[PDB]
Amino acid sequence: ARKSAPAT
Amino acid sequence: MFNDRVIVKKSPLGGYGVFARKSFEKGELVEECLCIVRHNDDWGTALEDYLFSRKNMSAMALGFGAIFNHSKDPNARHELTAGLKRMRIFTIKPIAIGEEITISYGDDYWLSRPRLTQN
Ligand SMILES: Nc1ncnc2c1ncn2[C@@H]1O[C@H](CSCC[C@H](N)C(=O)O)[C@@H](O)[C@H]1O
Numbered sequence: 236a237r238k239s240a241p242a243t
Numbered sequence: 244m245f246n247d248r249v250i251v252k253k254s255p256l257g258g259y260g261v262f263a264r265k266s267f268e269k270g271e272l273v274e275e276c277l278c279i280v281r282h283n284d285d286w287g288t289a290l291e292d293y294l295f296s297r298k299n300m301s302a303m304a305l306g307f308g309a310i311f312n313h314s315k316d317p318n319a320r321h322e323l324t325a326g327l328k329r330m331r332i333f334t335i336k337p338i339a340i341g342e343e344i345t346i347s348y349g350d351d352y353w354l355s356r357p358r359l360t361q362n
Contacts, residue, residue: 236351237283239351243325
């Protein structure tokens with residue numbers, strides 16, 4: 236799995 | 244590789260890491276970088292450990308974005324805009340000069356890599 240990408 | 248705020252150098256966590264060149268206040272912006280975005284399946288295997296992903300899209304952060312190491316006890320956080328076009332790294336607490344700046348990759352990144360040891 237790749238890194239998470241939290242939303243602004 | 245450096246700027247007025249940070250420097251890249253050997254990290255005790257592994258390989259290279261991003262370190263503070265100056266002190267940072269809580270909530271201060273550490274880095275803002277552009278990202279190249281494409282569907283998850285178009286990236287080959289080269290950047291599997293570097294990419295950020297949301298749904299069916301993955302993004303490769305330019306600038307210092309892809310160099311920040313991970314920590315279970317991070318002093319910074321990251322966020323990506325709609326479309327994953329830009330990424331911002333903000334501190335979540337004060338950071339002193341010489342301290343490594345870390346973010347959280349998310350649990351799955353590590354759970355999916357049992358052979359890799361987390362520092
Ligand atoms: N807390 C941590 N413990 C061990 N390795 C880590 C880590 N955080 C990051 N890494 C390493 O960094 C990789 C992602 S890329 C981050 C930059 C990397 N250190 C480099 O020199 O290029 C991970 O897959 C892992 O190998």
